[PDB]
Symmetry: T
Subunit: 143 residues, 12 copies
């Protein structure tokens, strides 16, 4: 179900909002400003994704999740308890989670096509476009 | 300890970030736009508070919390599982949590004065100023 | 035919442009500013929809409609002759007409997919996205 | 009566809003961009005139017209059913309708002076100023 | 005399500047933000009216009033000592005072026409335009 | 005749454009910046007045003047051949020429009322408003 | 009591709002623009101070003053009935009243520290900062 | 293959970037400014298309082309060696090349649907939308 | 002498300021807007050139000209008494006068190099750059 | 000949436009964003240089080059076929090509001085200024 | 004494203004842009600190220092004569000097509390806030 | 040598940066704001001149000066130890130092022409242009 994948993704969005703030505060190295500013852009993107997924859920006549509790329960994103990083470790982690979201947005898109929910398709394909652009850029950082 | 109160408040900030999004999505009544836009301003404020508290913690040589897990563990904010509200219920809840943050920022301020951490004082008094302005406005909504 | 639905929708757009101005001028109640400003945003949206539908028609090698006469002839939107409203009546009427446009944009989208007119699809799905967001918000006003 | 002329003019404004969109979509010749952009400015002006006339009517304790139906009934503007133009034909038509509005705004102004409605006078003289500037520019196009 | 009415109006402007701040601080109800922001726009308008009337007086070779003392002495506006309101009470009061200013600006306009002071006429008619727009909007709030 | 006064004023506008540039370049004293910047605002105003008067003339079916030659022939403004000033001398000269334009705009306004040219009236009264504001400010400089 | 000093200062703010407008309209000399613009900045500052003091009072659970009447009753600011000034006289008067506000903001700050009202302290110290900057600048004008 | 069509289009984009600059520099006639500015907008669009196609190629794990050499080798766009034009000749040429890109973007879109590359579809349909709008406008210039 | 050429050019600048306004008001044809706006840019350029030449003269210890009288006396620009034009006639005239200014700025530049006035050289070469760009564009209009 | 060097440089500009896009897409390493953004600024500079050189050529009565074909024929810039880089390799390549352009702009400048083409001199010296600033910055990257 | 510490800090501010420009010009490595831009932000901050400290001194009735001579005499900042750096060396040096300013601003703050100079306290605590944020960021660069 | 004069001028720039701040803080008289703001513009100009001269030095393969120490050693600018001024004294001092910089920029320009350093010439002539404009304005203040 479309709204089930939406909920799952909403859960990842708020979890990544937090995870990315970790990287924002705890990066080390002459790389600090760039990663500090870039992580800020990343978590702000995730705050919007969170809101947008929730609002698609509501639009669709269902209930978005409303507690951090359900988010942790529905997410497939590993929270990061460590508190120190080189930029390369941050990019590897973010890349991993991006590849996860990419897979899921594809699923979201495929599922919504099947159920004749075209709006959810164009939302999912728009997010895929962004994820694939970032995936490429992150791959290029790490190469 | 100053950094202990900071951590506690950081936990409330991310919890209220979520709680306020609930109110953002699930308000009902001819009041919808105003509460939808106002809650958006409120949660954006909480996103900044979260970041700022975390960054004061780091500055002070300690570790801010880095998971939703610790946040739920350290918060004194009740998450809201209900998914429908009149504006009056939203304002009552927000008011309650504001009164909670007000008390704690006072504590933060008092404690930091004692430990000779003046920066943390001016941060705490700046946040008090905002909380007391909102507390007054919310009291005026409900009267 | 794609261009036939386009024409129909173009007719509704100019009719709603007028209808919404009625609500803009004739709302009553302590609700006045909010509804006055919101209706202004709504009719400005409809002015753009009108222009865009007409311009898709032209692009497609056909003729958009060019008189209020044809608009009244092609529309399924009831004009509103009454000249006084509470905000709730305005929202109910706007909701009704929105549900009408939603149905038709779905048709437009489905029909254009069939005829291999992909541009018209992405236009129709973009408008659906907006209509479904407003439909949800209006449902929330009225609940 | 002042409000009677206001209503008449309100009817012309919405009719010209449509008529001018015709010219916007259906101009032909190496003149296309200039006329396309200029007609867009013209119809946006007419959308404001429409709103302003309606709002003067309301202010004056009367009811502006609220349907395209009454507009077609009250207008002295010929709708244009043709769907192809050279720029010269567009300017001739617009000039004609401008000369019509000029005459009527003079009447509006004279009538409002008589009835001691000074606000309506300053509104009418402001619109005359604009019409006479455009009339001159259009005469210069055609010369 | 033109300058006598100017002085009277200048006195009302500063008195309403204060009166409107009362409403700004002391409104109660789920209406709070809207009335708080709208009253702020209203008193800022009155601050400009005050300055403009004073400056017309100076231009005309006379002396505007320069103390709150003369203002209270020359005003026909009742100061409001009460410190709590519903929005409806605020709108009724503002409406009353608006109707008062409307009457006086008409007088100002008529008197200035007689004395051949055309500048003061166009100033008075510009203010009438604004007062009549607000009077209509306030009537619509209360209906 | 309205257009005759317009032409006369157009001639003064271009003459004052030049005269004011003299003051702009040739002021002396610790007053230099203020007078340099203020004269720049003054001549830019005169450049617009020039254009606007010319364009009213054209609108009215007549020909504005098109050479400096006719301007010098039609102006009642004394050109200034001297090349050094204290600010007080500049203000006295500008004041004189302002009083001249004020008189003429009154004439323009009166004459246009008589001939039923309302647009030219509202133009003349708008310029009077500006001239009387500047006249007051200049009187205040010199007092 | 903190709120008692707040009220007193609120009274001075509205009185200085008026007093400063006097100086704004009635300054004489080649100094006119600078003093006209500077007084405009000064009274706009006082309008904000007025609003802010009133709003601190409300926040604190008390009632700000709501009439010009109480303002004149609570102020220690002498109103200025004279209607003509050299810039030096304006600066001397403003300086005097500034020194008065400086003393009182110190009192406000000291008193609020005692009562544990930290928000009011940071407000009072912020205003002191501004007053001491202006006091220095005004002393420099007069030296 | 999707990436093969992308590469082809990337080649056309840089070739049209140049071709359009030819028209930019070498248009003749009283049409000069309009065509000079419009061609500037057109080539800036092509510079972005070039970059975007290249970046989609990279995202997709392939290599965009990196020399003018490959571009000339992969393009189906005829370079223009002539150095003088009337606007009509420029529009005919641009129209031709647009019709070419339209065909190819359709192919791109169809092919990407087949291979399950949804991002490339939404990119191709977005570009089609723009090409069909320009095709219509250019047809209207030439009619 | 450098300052002699400066004065000559200053005279042409104010004469062209007027001449170009003629073209601004009196162009005829479907070309009207473009020429109306372009002439406005041209005369605004000439107003700046005028001011800049005058200010270079002053800088150099000499006196710029301060009357329209000297301008007409020092200019080699023919004033235009005719009051109706096709765009082609306007461009031919402007081109002629441009070729004149180009020649003179070359002279200015050469002369200033000789006298070791480098500032005047860089001013003259900057103006040449602009004149040669416009000369090319005007040649392209007329071809 | 001046125009011969201009043409040569125009050829390098479009070749570097492409070459720099290579570096834009194909940089690898934790350096990615900085080099991605900086290369974007560099190629945008080259797009302007290209246009400006072409337009100087036209101004000078000659024909700029109008095909990628002539560009490859006239350039002394080696195209880069490789598709992967560390930032250091990108900077070395860009530095090399910069040193090439620097030499040529000197030649351009010297040659134009000889032929009395001062405009082309000030253009060449302006570009030298930029090239020498970038050369220094690039040397500093590599040191 | 408060003003003695102010003077000392003023001396460091201008010395660091220079020192930081050294780092701005003489950094080496693929780090160049980031350090070049960041040092520019740092020295601009120091220019403001310098001005603000000087202006607090003046406000307090004392004399800020007015020569580079006294600055070198009063500073505890070592000037840097070396002319080449890796970014790590720049950050270590800046960190050292920051730790120095932090200590001194604490002293300033403590001393001003003692002397009842609250304005100087809030200034000192504001600067501490900034220094501690930068100290943390610099520590993070170097870790 | 070009770089020797550059260094000398760099030394004056930082010395004048300080000297001008003296005038900024210590001007007395009803002239205070104007001189306070103007000196702020002047020292900000000198901060840029300083940076630009240093960066030309680096570009040229030499080392700009990096301590206040060398600046005081290389400058021909007298530092000002006095701490109180009338505006006339400030303008006389600034004028003197300007005349000094003018002479030196001429030398810089002449020397750079000789050594074939054209970039340094265009930099020197640009600064001369500014110095001669300010010299004229300052002469006009003092006359
Ligand atoms: Zn941060
Ligand atoms: Zn951001
Ligand atoms: Zn939302
Ligand atoms: Zn997931
Ligand atoms: Zn750690
Ligand atoms: Zn490490
Ligand atoms: Zn929303
Ligand atoms: Zn927001
Ligand atoms: Zn942060
Ligand atoms: Zn808590
Ligand atoms: Zn529900
Ligand atoms: Zn309910
Ligand atoms: Zn309205
Ligand atoms: Zn709007
Ligand atoms: Zn359109
Ligand atoms: Zn329909
Ligand atoms: Zn009714
Ligand atoms: Zn009702
Ligand atoms: Zn889309
Ligand atoms: Zn369009
Ligand atoms: Zn528009
Ligand atoms: Zn409206
Ligand atoms: Zn009519
Ligand atoms: Zn047709
Ligand atoms: Zn035709
Ligand atoms: Zn008016
Ligand atoms: Zn407020
Ligand atoms: Zn406001
Ligand atoms: Zn004022
Ligand atoms: Zn009254
Ligand atoms: Zn109460
Ligand atoms: Zn109640
Ligand atoms: Zn100037
Ligand atoms: Zn200006
Ligand atoms: Zn004009
Ligand atoms: Zn006259
Ligand atoms: Zn002289
Ligand atoms: Zn004198
Ligand atoms: Zn004013
Ligand atoms: Zn202001
Ligand atoms: Zn307020
Ligand atoms: Zn007091
Ligand atoms: Zn008097
Ligand atoms: Zn006096
Ligand atoms: Zn161009
Ligand atoms: Zn552009
Ligand atoms: Zn790119
Ligand atoms: Zn192709
Ligand atoms: Zn040719
Ligand atoms: Zn031809
Ligand atoms: Zn115009
Ligand atoms: Zn313009
Ligand atoms: Zn000037
Ligand atoms: Zn000449
Ligand atoms: Zn004629
Ligand atoms: Zn003709
Ligand atoms: Zn990119
Ligand atoms: Zn860019
Ligand atoms: Zn171009
Ligand atoms: Zn080359
Ligand atoms: Zn590869
Ligand atoms: Zn590698
Ligand atoms: Zn730099
Ligand atoms: Zn900066
Ligand atoms: Zn300062
Ligand atoms: Zn120190
Ligand atoms: Zn070295
Ligand atoms: Zn190294
Ligand atoms: Zn603070
Ligand atoms: Zn200052
Ligand atoms: Zn500044
Ligand atoms: Zn720099
Ligand atoms: Zn020197
Ligand atoms: Zn002293
Ligand atoms: Zn003195
Ligand atoms: Zn230059």
């Amino acid at each position: 179900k479309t709204f089930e994948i939406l909920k799952h993704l909403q859960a990842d969005a708020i979890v990544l909002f937090m995870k990315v703030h970790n990287f924002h505060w705890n990066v080390k190295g002459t790389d600090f400003f760039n990663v500090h500013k870039a992580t800020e852009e990343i978590y702000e993107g995730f705050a919007d994704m969170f809101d947008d997924l929730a609002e698609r859920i509501a639009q669709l006549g269902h209930h978005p999740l409303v507690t951090l509790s359900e988010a942790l329960k529905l997410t497939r994103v590993k929270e990061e308890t460590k508190t120190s990083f080189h930029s390369k470790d941050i990019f590897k982690e973010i890349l991993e989670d991006y590849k996860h979201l990419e897979k899921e947005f594809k699923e979201l898109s495929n599922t919504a096509e099947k159920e004749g929910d075209k709006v959810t398709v164009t939302y999912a394909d728009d997010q895929l476009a962004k994820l694939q652009k970032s995936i490429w850029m992150l791959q290029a950082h790490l190469a």
